[PDB]
């Protein structure tokens, strides 16, 4: 596998978005993974609607601004037959009545693939051969809220008790040695003013740090 | 006109490039504008060759790594009958022999449209209705070099004596009021590591700040 991967360089990733005061991280992780797979299939990078996911996927078990899961989002897209563009269905960061229109759909999926739980080498393989991957992580620490640069490593991080969905867009290493200071390249949904212009490097191959490989998945397009 | 526009979210913009040690900003601004118009016309996003413009547009009045102008680059593409892909004519950040190959051409233009000098409302209309727009600006400040986040506003900026070509990919505002804290969304060519993932927000409707609306143009495809 490559020593480094960054899907941003290949046209798979939309700009950093901001969920604002709504617990919709799962919808942003899901649209980021679907954006990547739809681009891999058609060559067109089109921002997808998190608001469509927040408003319309309660039947699949999501709870809008009160939380949800990327897999349930991919299930909704499948049961629904489509997902609207962000342009047609804008994000307002609150729970609202479903406004989905098939005429505005720009994406579809047949379900999703799960990466082997807890296996960082399985995740590395999926990132290198599929594109961006939705993952869950433990973001419940002030060190993450205030993160700025470098490789994120939090001693109190859990790999089991996760509370935030994000998008792995690559991996790499700091310094000249490929096996030293490895990291996962993660796109957050807290705007570009958070972290390193909206991104964070999370320690890689350090015992599934913060649970990045515990519950990873991607849509099948 | 829309309250905000972001052509990156619609597939019109290639990933951020890096001119390195060559004064070829004008060529990157020109390829970015043609990449957007060729995508609007065909639905295919193809990276274009800045190196073809650097090496071949001296007859039109450009000077390669010593500087140039987007309008002269669109004139070269028109007179030349085409422009090659980045893949077929790679960027090497130095003045080299013209190696234009018609069989590798993936873009054409019949000339260009200019935006009336100094008219930010005319620039806003062009961005909303056409796609990304080539523009000149005053980038000669340490504040721009070390720019990292927020709306860029530099007191020492000129709206008349400009030195750097960039690409306006959209516009927006901060918060709920669409008329307050407005900005131009600008793609630079100093690599993704510069600024905010290679982008900068420049103050909009603040007296043509840094000259963004002084010499704007786009190719006619
Ligand atoms: C991130 O913005 C949110 C914050 C939720 C605060 C209330 N986190 C989630 O949505 C999280 C993401 C997974 C760990 C990937 N899931 C979650 O909180 O789900 C809650 C839930 C429980 C049962 C049924 C539906 C949702
Ligand atoms: C940006 O990389 C370059 C830096 C040039 C350093 C020498 N800027 C330009 O090319 C600039 C862009 C315009 C303002 C849009 N143009 C410029 O410097 O042109 C110089 C020139 C004069 C006469 C004939 C050709 C070129
Ligand atoms: Cl971004
Ligand atoms: Cl999930
Ligand atoms: Cl490794
Ligand atoms: Cl010009
Ligand atoms: Cl002309
Ligand atoms: Cl306005």
Residue numbers in the entry:
A (entry chain B): 223 to 443
B (entry chain A): 1 to 221
How do the authors describe this structure?
Several drug screening campaigns identified Calpeptin as a drug candidate against SARS-CoV-2. Binding of the activated compounds to Mpro, CatL, CatK, and CatV was characterized by X-ray crystallography and their antiviral activity against SARS-CoV-2 was confirmed in cellular infection assays. All three compounds bind in a highly similar manner to the catalytic site of each protease.
Moreover, Calpeptin binding was also confirmed in a CatK and CatV structure. No differences in the binding mode of Calpeptin to the highly similar CatK and CatV are observed. For all three compounds, Ki values for CatV are similar to CatL, whereas CatB values are generally in the nanomolar range.
